């Protein structure tokens, strides 16, 4: 995938989080990106190895 220039690999899945309007990505304790907001439909997904 390549989401707004951010590249990687994994499995996309529906998510049940509510990003604030000023947020785009979401990290964890390991500091890797776990969720992303689709830049077209504006839905939130979950990235899994």
């Amino acid at each position: 995938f390549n989401f707004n220039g951010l590249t990687g690999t994994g499995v996309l899945t529906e998510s049940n989080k509510k990003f604030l309007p000023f947020q785009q990505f979401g990290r964890d304790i390991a500091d890797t990106t776990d969720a992303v907001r689709d830049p077209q439909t504006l839905e939130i997904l979950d990235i899994t190895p």
Partner: peptide, 24 residues
């Protein structure tokens, strides 16, 4: 006059979503 601020004055540092963690 003077007053005491107890724990006021905190804002979001970055624009990244986090949940169920403790950040420094």
């Amino acid at each position: 006059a003077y007053t005491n601020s107890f724990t006021r004055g905190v804002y979001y540092p970055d624009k990244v979503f986090r949940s169920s963690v403790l950040h420094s």
